[PDB]
Amino acid sequence: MDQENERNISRLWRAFRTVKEMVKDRGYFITQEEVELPLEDFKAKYCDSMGRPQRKMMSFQANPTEESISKFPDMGSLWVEFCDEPSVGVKTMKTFVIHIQEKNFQTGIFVYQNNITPSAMKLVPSIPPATIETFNEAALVVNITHHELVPKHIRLSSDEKRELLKRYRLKESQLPRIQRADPVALYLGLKRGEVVKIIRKSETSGRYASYRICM
Amino acid sequence: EIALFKYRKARLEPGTAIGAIGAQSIGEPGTQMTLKTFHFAGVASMNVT
Amino acid sequence: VRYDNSGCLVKREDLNKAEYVDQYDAERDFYHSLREYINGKATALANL
Amino acid sequence: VKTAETGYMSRRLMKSLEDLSCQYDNTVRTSANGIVQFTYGGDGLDPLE
Amino acid sequence: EKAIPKDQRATTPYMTKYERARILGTRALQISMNAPVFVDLEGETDPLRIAMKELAEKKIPLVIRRYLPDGSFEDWSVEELIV
Amino acid sequence: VAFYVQDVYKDNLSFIQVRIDLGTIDKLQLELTIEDIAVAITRASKLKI
Amino acid sequence: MLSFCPSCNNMLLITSGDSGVYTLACRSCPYEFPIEGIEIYDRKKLPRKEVDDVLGGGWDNVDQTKTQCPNYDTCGGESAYFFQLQIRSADEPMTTFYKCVNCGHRWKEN
Amino acid sequence: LPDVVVKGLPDISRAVINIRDDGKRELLVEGYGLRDVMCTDGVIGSRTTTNHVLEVFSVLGIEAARYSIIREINYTMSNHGMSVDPRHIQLLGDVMTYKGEVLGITRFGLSKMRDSVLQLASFEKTTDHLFDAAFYMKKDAVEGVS
Ligand SMILES: [Zn+2]
Ligand SMILES: [Zn+2]
């Protein structure tokens, strides 16, 4: 029926759009004509003839922008994938991490559907120069950075962090910390010691900049 | 000259225990703030605390 | 003067974008408002 | 009966915020020299003045 | 050592209220310990009012070390502060 | 959404009959169907069905 | 099931025994009632309240479209009362609600 | 069986349609499912907020939690017309959202924000804090005020 099918298609389409925005915001190369994909084109291309959503045809690779690879010294390609199974097992997670290691990708994003067992949670850190991030579909229906209460976060490179530390004459542990696994930090994909600059907008004072450090 | 003087002397003076002042300025209105019934924008049963 | 986050200058064509906000920005805001107020008074003369 | 709860809340707030101060580099820092705000309120203006 | 030179000073040249209170307190204590005064007293017999009179025309020889919160102080003579 | 819930014993079977009216669904414009109610019943944990 | 015993006035527990037939057995006294033939049932009538209308009078003096009604076992009407209403987000097609002129049975399309 | 949920969100107790002064309609629900409310179609997912602060934190990050703290305290203070300057509210919000998480102002929050032995001993749980400090051999730097 329409309730079991069209709502699922719309949720998957909005999740795809949010993942595209997330990958673009990290500095990877995504054109504006891919992120503004309407519902009709998504149903035409990424959906089956009988309305079923297929997800093995949805996974894609992302490469760094020239500006990003200029500012950031090292930055590789991601392979964002959507699992077809509703409840991912250890076997499919091991298959995914084996795929990521074999194809020599610097990072990977595993968008699961309903729930992931802790026996599969414990296996995402397994690869030394690569990292794996997991995102729930319901956590991807609405983009959190477009929310009014969330101001603009901007990650800073190591040279940028060093310049900030030199200007304010302080060590890394003195900045106000931000936890990883925070939704905004998960959106930006921040590592330990990486510094994000926040542009707050208060009515009284206008725009002013604060800083935060992961972990 | 007056505007610049007011702005330049209105800056927070270094060494001020601003946390103490803020803590008191949040705490002491609680003494004068008596309990009064409140409702959220024209609906009676929402009974916000 | 508005340096960027890198410690370098900022070109005078994209100063107002929301990624180079410094600690002095509110001060700058004040000055603008100050000038704007004087502007109003000048306008209040000119139309007269 | 409001006085007990209000005084308890005031004591908790003041014990939490007693260590903050505005250092000479216009940054609010704790006792252990960690920055809470880079400028007080985003513009460094005392509400007194 | 860690002293900022007399031209790279990046702290406000105004004299805050706490510095005023501490300067007057120290000067009054020094006067109460029988120190000479550089202002002509007119029969005032209280160290604090004599210290106030000394401040009124900037005769206190004390200076203020404004310790920045990283271990680098900053000298300011009382006669140089604006107040 | 149910007119009633009843328990019926057959000769060798026992079941529970629920009568859902489409009139209330149409009058409330709930996007709900009978199989949706069935799968929602399956998503109950305490019943262990 | 709230059946009460006619001997000791106790609760009737239905048991299968071992032969596979359910009986209104009573464990306080020798008495049961097999349910062969006619079946027994206990209906609890849930309350029926007057809930708020959503499409009460939403098709008065409105235009009529030409759409085939899904129910062709009752009416052969081809003129349907329709109404355009934005129900989903602004990036999705505008849904509409329309009904037959004879047999009702309102239905919507996106 | 007749107490099972068949359509909706488990934590939403009730929903009321309200009219704002300009005539536009909004929806007020009483529950804890912020993400489910703001992810459903038909509701704008960019301007939906809630007065609860832990939900705002867990859904939209520590900065949105700070904004929610500031807005809620300012609304409560301005409801009584006590005229508290918002800079103190901003300072309090920056204090509770200092260490990356909303730690709050209590004996379980000061024990996480502050590492000073003597201040935590003087506030609450004197014996437990002092004995734990003795056992873990934690040095205390005399830099605070207490
Ligand atoms: Zn009996
Ligand atoms: Zn019909």
Closest chain A CA to residue F34: A1
Q: Which domain holds residue G25?
A: 1-47
G5 is an annotated ligand-binding site residue: yes
**Structural tokens at position G6:** 């006619």
CATH fit for domain A143-215, picks 1.10.645.10, 3.20.20.70, 2.70.70.10, 3.90.940.20:
3.90.940.20
Residue A116 CA to chain centroid, in angstroms?
Answer: 18
* C-alpha separations of B22 from B14, B27, D20, H42, H145 in Å: 15, 8, 10, 42, 16
CA distance F26 to G107: 9
What lies within 8 Å, CB to CB, of G73 at 6+ separation is: none
Give the CATH fold of the A2-142 domain. Answer: 3.40.1340
Q: How many CA atoms within 13 Å lie on the side-chain side of C17?
A: 10
DSSP state for residue A124 in the 8-state scheme:
S
G100 is an annotated ligand-binding site residue: yes
What are the b/e assignments for A178-196, b being 16+ CB within 10 Å?
A: beeebbbbbbbbbeeebbb
H42 touches chain F (CB under 8 A): no
CA distance A136 to A144: 13
What technique was this entry resolved by?
A: cryo-EM
D22 touches chain B (CB under 8 A): yes
The CATH number assigned to the domain holding E36 equals 3.90.940.10
Query: Which of left, alpha, beta for B15 (phi over 0: left; psi -120 to 50: alpha)?
Result: left
Of the candidates E56, A4, H23, A208, the residue with the CA atom closest to the CA atom of residue D44:
A208
Block residue for tokens 């990624």: C19
Please provide residue A109's backbone torsions phi and psi, each rounded to the nearest 5 degrees: -120, 125
Closest chain F CA to residue H10: F44
Q: Which domain holds residue E47?
A: 1-83
DSSP state for residue A203 in the 8-state scheme:
T
Residues of chain A neighbouring C33 (CB-CB closer than 8 A): none
Partner residues linked to G84 by β-bridges: G96
Resolution (A): 3.4
CA distance A133 to A131: 7
Of the candidates A112, A101, A98, the residue with the CA atom closest to the CA atom of residue A59:
A112
Output the CA G23–ligand 1 centroid distance in Å.
13
Q: Give chain D's end-to-end CA distance (angstroms, integer).
A: 36
Torsion of CA A141, A143, A148, A151, to 10 degrees: 150
Ligand located closest to G71 CA: 2
Residue E80 CA to chain centroid, in angstroms?
Answer: 10
CB pairs under 8 A between B and E: 14
Annotate H3-60 with DSSP letters as a single string: T---SS-TT---EEEEE-TTS-EEEEE-SS-HHHHHHSTTS-SSS---S-HHHHHHHH
Of the candidates A193, A195, A197, the residue with the CA atom closest to the CA atom of residue A154:
A197
CB pairs under 8 A between D and E: 14
Q: Which 108-167 residues of chain A touch chain C by CB within 8 A?
A: 152, 154, 156, 159-160, 163-164, 167
* C-alpha separations of A117 from A93, A112, E18, G110, H59 in Å: 10, 11, 60, 37, 21
CA distance G41 to G54: 36
G2-11 long-range Cβ contacts below 8 angstroms, 24+ apart: G2/G42, G3/G40, G5/G29, G5/G31, G6/G31, G7/G31
CA distance A56 to A81: 8
CA distance H99 to D23: 20
**Structural tokens at position A125:** 């850190």
